[PDB]
UniProtKB/Swiss-Prot annotation, chains A, B:
Organism in which the protein naturally occurs: Methanothermobacter thermautotrophicus (strain ATCC 29096 / DSM 1053 / JCM 10044 / NBRC 100330 / Delta H)
Keyword field contains Calcium: no
List of catalytic residues: 62
Enzyme category, top tier: lyase
GO CC list: cytosol
UniProt cross-references to SMART domains, sorted A to Z: OMPdecase
GO biological process annotation, one example: 'de novo' UMP biosynthetic process
Protein name: Orotidine 5'-phosphate decarboxylase
Function, as annotated: Catalyzes the decarboxylation of orotidine 5'-monophosphate (OMP) to uridine 5'-monophosphate (UMP).
Subunit structure: Homodimer.
Gene3D superfamilies: Aldolase class I
Amino acid sequence: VMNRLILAMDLMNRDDALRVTGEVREYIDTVAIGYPLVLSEGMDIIAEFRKRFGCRIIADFKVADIPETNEKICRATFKAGADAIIVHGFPGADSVRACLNVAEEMGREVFLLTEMSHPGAEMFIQGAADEIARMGVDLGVKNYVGPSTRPERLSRLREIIGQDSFLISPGVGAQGGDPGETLRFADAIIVGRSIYLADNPAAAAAGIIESI
Amino acid sequence: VMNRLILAMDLMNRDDALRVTGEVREYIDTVAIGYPLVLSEGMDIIAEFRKRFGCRIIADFKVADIPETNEKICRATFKAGADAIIVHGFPGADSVRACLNVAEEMGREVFLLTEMSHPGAEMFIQGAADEIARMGVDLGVKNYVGPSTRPERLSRLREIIGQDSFLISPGVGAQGGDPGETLRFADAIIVGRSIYLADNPAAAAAGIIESI
Ligand SMILES: O=c1cnn([C@@H]2O[C@H](COP(=O)(O)O)[C@@H](O)[C@H]2O)c(=O)[nH]1
Ligand SMILES: O=c1cnn([C@@H]2O[C@H](COP(=O)(O)O)[C@@H](O)[C@H]2O)c(=O)[nH]1
């Protein structure tokens, strides 16, 4: 992705989300849109962003349901125009396969979330993360999400998925992760608050890019 | 699109197509892939390009069949990963609507080809072009294709579709169209041979961009 930087657009109103995204578009061509914005403004916001900014959109929906429901969520999300969707791996292989099947049918991509960046991830997710990553490899997953806040875990994840897989990483800035260190292992970093809550989002994005 | 320039990749072998596209990727982020490449290397080439170059892909398939077949062609094309498809308008409204319905279902876009750039277009297409464009407006089409070789016709087309519609235009360079003049009316120009047959495709792309 451009400058190896993905904007996590978690503002909850359309006007502010459009303003900040437009201000940083010269530095970023990929935006992660999640439920905070979608549940506040509707799924139509995805197509609006894609058209207005000409950016790729990753739906950060952390899909985590049974196979049948996962298929419906993925279909609705790709119908809305998303280029990719983030899916949790802890619910198991059948749930991930359901997402992969819809992405195959619709010409889109699935990103498998393996270990999360927040403190609570140490309770249950971290202990299953290596196996979740190996499961992804076994299913043919080529895109993964791992934690900026734990570079030793990001390194282990990169080890399991190989150099050919694409790995993106949130937890940079506000959560404590460092851009440069994270990019030693991840292909791109996801940054939300450090950019969208900044007094000058464009200056914040430019500063992150210059630091790397 | 980046630099308002779209590469028409009509080489017929994968190695040469990948080489030229990689050489000009710093100048272009949108590639039109048509049947010369797809019928020679397979539909899988679309996903390969999208991944390898991170570019948007327009399938320049000039869809021109009955509604039922158009739906199948569009479904197969979007399944392959194309972001948009070019559809002929001369076969009529039902044929275009079939394409629009599949694009809506799959979160993608349809570009309506209204008047073609080659000499033969004067025989039958030119006389129906204004009505084909008006039909597109009536159907809700927002993306159009018009001829670089006839700027007065491109102007008339822009007049019918309005300033809000997106208009791209082939026939630049080899066919005689001028980049600058075309961009007075079109949002982006499509260029094939002037770039892909050049001794230095990157220098050719850079030269077009500097001229505008
Ligand atoms: O393990 C994960 C997975 N996803 N995200 C998401 O990535 C973004 C990070 O935002 P931030 O830069 O403001 O902390 C938010 O959308 C958040 O839901 C994390 O932070 N950690
Ligand atoms: O009216 C039209 C519609 N489509 N194209 C297409 O646009 C490209 C133009 O290539 P060129 O720059 O090599 O002439 C080719 O893929 C061609 O099929 C035209 O040239 N004219």
